[PDB]
Subunit: 51 residues, 2 copies
């Protein structure tokens, strides 16, 4: 913020991003989330062998 200026939505969002970065724990578990591209690729192969 500047005495003569006017704050923009972009600066407000980048500051909000730093707040969300603090919510991220310094150490976290690498819990694997199955991607849809991988999920369906496996399902297609399983259906190819009739399973």
């Amino acid at each position: 913020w500047k005495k003569g200026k006017t704050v923009s939505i972009e600066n407000l969002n980048t500051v909000t991003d730093k707040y969300a970065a603090a919510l991220v724990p310094k150490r976290k578990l690498a819990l694997p989330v199955l991607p849809e591209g991988v999920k369906k690729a496996v399902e297609d192969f399983a259906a190819s062998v009739g399973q």
Copy 2:
């Protein structure tokens, strides 16, 4: 084979294909062979989550 003709390698191969078709059992197990494209796609995702 024809009295005036001469057999070609293509006809001999198509006849050999029928012999190999007889080796295929009428009923068989759908044993799934993991494709390289699927094998590496899974390995890439596992390495992406650090595993």
